[PDB]
Design an enzyme around this catalytic site. Structure first.
Site, PDB file in Angstrom:
ATOM      1  N   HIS A  87      -2.883   6.550  -3.019  1.00 12.16           N
ATOM      2  CA  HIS A  87      -2.531   5.541  -1.999  1.00 12.16           C
ATOM      3  C   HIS A  87      -3.452   4.333  -1.955  1.00 12.16           C
ATOM      4  O   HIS A  87      -2.962   3.210  -1.880  1.00 12.16           O
ATOM      5  CB  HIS A  87      -2.393   6.186  -0.600  1.00 12.16           C
ATOM      6  N   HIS A 120       6.774   8.908   1.827  1.00 17.88           N
ATOM      7  CA  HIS A 120       7.942   9.719   1.418  1.00 17.88           C
ATOM      8  C   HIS A 120       9.271   9.130   1.878  1.00 17.88           C
ATOM      9  O   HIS A 120      10.236   9.119   1.115  1.00 17.88           O
ATOM     10  CB  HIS A 120       7.774  11.179   1.830  1.00 17.88           C
TER      11      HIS A 120
END
Ligand SMILES: C[C@@](CCc1ccc(-c2ccc(OCCCN3CCOCC3)cc2)cc1)(C(=O)NO)S(C)(=O)=O
Ligand SMILES: [Zn+2]
Length: 299
Positions: free
Chosen positions: A264, A78
């Site tokens: 991911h 993030h």
């Protein structure tokens, strides 16, 4: 010319790690040209530095984790998405614990703290990785692909077998030439299933997770009293995650990313495949910003 950028001033923030639940102090510092983004564990003696590069990704369970021996920096996606979105090339990221603070679960608080401090253009051309050939990775029903494109575009498709996701937008495409990362992507929050909370917690995950830093999904509704920030918030967060994960290349991309139920693990496998296939990319610079296919907001 499109110049390299760093921070104008030091930025400080505090929060908790989504997965560890630990309190963490974060400092963002300016850095010289060609430093890249370097994470630093300042709670350790000696201090451990980890460049935010694909080669330093050690775990991809339910976040992207940077690893150097037994030292880790968890949930970098993030903060890296905020830095990619604002065009920050060089910075030192100091952390007092093993995980980046989750904040409100989006890149919004990071973008605001950075933009409050301001950016500093540096006397060096910004380097980009231009996609020359299609590079695709698959594993089962998941797919992540880089395609040549004269700009930067991200497409994503999710498919959760849950009532809160059915009838809801599960596909989104964002061209950064006509769409603002800040307005349309940065505020999309992370999400998780309340049904899995006890399981996750037994695996040392989501220990800091709550309605304050995530969209918590129950069996038939979102638990968050105030609802969603976007109707397509779930797929928009996956685009935010992809931008952060792709920034582990060490430079901004000139191309298109397409994610098909990816996360991911597959995003990092796509970067490893791209890095290895040197005929599919090249490093480019734009010595004249007036003719470049991309533009950044004023610093
Ligand atoms: C991996 C990923 C998700 C990360 C993630 C994982 C788990 C949770 C999560 C899950 C359950 C939860 O219930 C909390 C229970 C709270 N309860 C509710 C009932 O009352 C008591 C408290 C809170 C948080 C939130 C986010 C990500 O964003 N990576 O960047 S993603 C979107 O790509 O899949
Ligand atoms: Zn995320």
């Amino acid at each position: 010319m499109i110049k390299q950028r760093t921070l104008k001033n030091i930025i400080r923030a505090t929060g908790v790690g989504l997965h560890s639940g630990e309190k963490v102090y974060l400092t963002l510092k300016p850095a010289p040209v060609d430093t890249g983004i370097v994470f630093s564990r300042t709670d350790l003696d000696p201090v451990v530095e980890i460049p935010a590069r694909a080669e330093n990704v050690g775990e991809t369970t339910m976040s992207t984790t940077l690893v150097k021996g037994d030292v880790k920096v968890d949930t970098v996606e993030h903060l890296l998405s905020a830095m990619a979105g604002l065009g920050i090339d060089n910075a030192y990221v100091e952390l007092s614990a093993s995980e980046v603070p989750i904040m409100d679960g989006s890149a919004g608080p990071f973008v605001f703290l950075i933009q409050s401090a301001g950016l500093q253009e540096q006397e060096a051309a910004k380097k980009f990785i231009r996609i020359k050939r299609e590079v695709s990775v698959e594993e089962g029903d998941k797919r992540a692909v880089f395609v040549p494109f004269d700009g930067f575009k991200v497409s994503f498709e999710i498919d959760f077998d849950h009532p809160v996701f059915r009838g809801r937008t599960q596909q989104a495409s964002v061209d950064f030439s006509s769409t603002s990362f800040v307005k349309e992507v940065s505020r999309a929050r992370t999400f998780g299933f309340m049904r899995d909370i006890e399981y996750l917690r037994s695996q040392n995950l989501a220990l800091g997770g709550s309605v304050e830093n995530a969209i918590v999904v129950d069996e038939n509704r979102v638990l968050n009293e105030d609802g969603l920030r976007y109707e397509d918030e779930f797929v928009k967060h996956k685009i935010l995650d992809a931008i952060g994960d792709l920034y582990l290349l060490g430079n901004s991309l000139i191309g298109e990313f397409r994610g098909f139920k990816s996360g991911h693990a597959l995003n990092n496998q796509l970067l490893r495949t791209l890095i290895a296939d040197k005929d599919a990319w090249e490093v480019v610079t734009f010595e004249d910003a007036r003719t470049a296919p991309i533009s950044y907001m004023r610093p």
